[PDB]
């Protein structure tokens, strides 16, 4: 990984420690985007099975 430009660091997001056995399926959705030089992102966490 050579020619660098930017490097941002953050803690993990959208992850927990839950223990269950059954029907608990979840859906994760994001919005990747690139507008005005900013790779925008919109999200909506919707736990649903």
């Amino acid at each position: 990984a050579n020619n660098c430009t930017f490097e941002y660091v953050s803690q993990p997001f959208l992850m927990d420690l839950e223990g269950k056995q059954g029907n608990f399926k979840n859906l994760r959705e994001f919005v990747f985007k690139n507008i005005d030089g900013y790779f925008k992102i919109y999200s909506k966490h919707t736990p649903i099975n």
Binding site: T5, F6, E7, Y8
Partner: protein, 49 residues
Amino acid sequence: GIYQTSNFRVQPTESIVRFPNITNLCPFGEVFNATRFASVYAWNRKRIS
């Protein structure tokens, strides 16, 4: 009779100023106060965003 002459509106008492913080915590500090500064021939950079 009655004649609508003028209006007497209540003016704002003051103006409250403050910032909502938002994208914050700049590491910009660790630029001037550091150790092992490079030489003149050597080139260095530190992108901050």
